[PDB]
Write a protein that binds this ligand. Structure first.
Ligand SMILES: *[C@@H]1O[C@H](CO)[C@@H](O[C@@H]2O[C@H](CO)[C@@H](O[C@@H]3O[C@H](CO)[C@@H](O)[C@H](O)[C@@H]3O)[C@H](O)[C@H]2NC(C)=O)[C@H](O)[C@H]1NC(C)=O
Ligand SMILES: *[C@H]1O[C@H](CO)[C@@H](O)[C@H](O)[C@H]1NC(C)=O
Lengths: 55, 175
């Protein structure tokens, strides 16, 4: 692949939400970039904005 | 406007009347004078302020929505994402345009109405003591000093008190 930071290989990122009472199971015989934990999820009034304005 | 008083039977307006929106001007034996009507002035102001409230400061609150600017060409979804927003903005722009149009037509006809109302309030007070010139003026057919003129302005004018005098002049004889 195009050399980037000296490497021409890549990592492809994925996500999996696990609802309470559920269970996560990872199975792989190679090429896994394992998770370390989980981020907590909230529903609120948040969002993101692309801007170059000085705060 | 619909009422034909302002920019109609009332020639022009008074830049001189700065204490009200509507009022009177008069000329009697001793002189001239002028004074603003508070009532009609407040009716107009009040209605326009009510109207102004409904419009002003009533914003929704929105947080995370869809994206609206794009870095790369994508196709089917971004087309749709753009169509949704574009469609939304035009319907809202129609909404704004129409509101100002209807609102403004309404404010104009309304304030026209309040002028004319004053006129009919005064016309009715003056009974058979006055005749209308048709330029917004009543020709009072009897002596009316500034106190008399004021009684009219504050609606306490008693037309029975000046009836015989008025009638007489309105219907004088060539003799
Ligand atoms: C497959 O083809 C691609 C493109 O030809 C090869 O990528 C190229 O890999 C070389 C490794 O020598 C990269 O060289 C490095 O260039 C950078 C910037 O010039 C410099 O910092 C280093 O000194 C080094 O020379 C080269 O830039 C890179 N080009 C691209 C587009 O990625 C890849 O190696 C080929 N693999 C095979 C088996 O042919
Ligand atoms: C008669 O009209 C109003 C009624 O509130 C009163 O305030 C006004 O001052 C009166 N006119 C005069 C000269 O007092």
């Amino acid at each position: 692949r195009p050399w980037v930071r000296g490497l021409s290989s890549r990592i492809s990122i994925y996500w999996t939400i696990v609802k309470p009472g559920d269970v996560l199971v990872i199975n792989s015989n190679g090429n896994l970039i394992a998770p370390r934990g989980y981020f907590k999820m909230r529903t609120g009034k948040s969002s993101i904005m692309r801007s170059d304005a000085p705060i | 406007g619909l009422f034909g008083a302002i920019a109609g039977f009332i020639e022009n307006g008074w830049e001189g009347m700065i204490d009200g929106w509507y009022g009177f001007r008069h000329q009697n034996s001793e002189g001239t004078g002028q004074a603003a009507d508070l009532k009609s002035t407040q009716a107009a102001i009040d209605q326009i302020n009510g109207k102004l409230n409904r419009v002003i400061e009533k914003t929704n609150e929105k947080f995370h929505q869809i994206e609206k600017e794009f870095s790369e060409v994508e196709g089917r979804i971004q087309d749709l994402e753009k169509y949704v927003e574009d469609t939304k903005i035009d319907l809202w722009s129609y909404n704004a345009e129409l509101l100002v149009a209807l609102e403004n037509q309404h404010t104009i006809d309304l304030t026209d109405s309040e002028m004319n109302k004053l006129f009919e309030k005064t016309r009715r007070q003056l009974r058979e003591n006055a005749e209308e010139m048709g330029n917004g003026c009543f020709k009072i057919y009897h002596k009316c000093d500034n106190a008399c003129i004021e009684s009219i302005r504050n609606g306490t004018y008693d037309h029975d008190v000046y009836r015989d005098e008025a009638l007489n002049n309105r219907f004088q004889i060539k003799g």
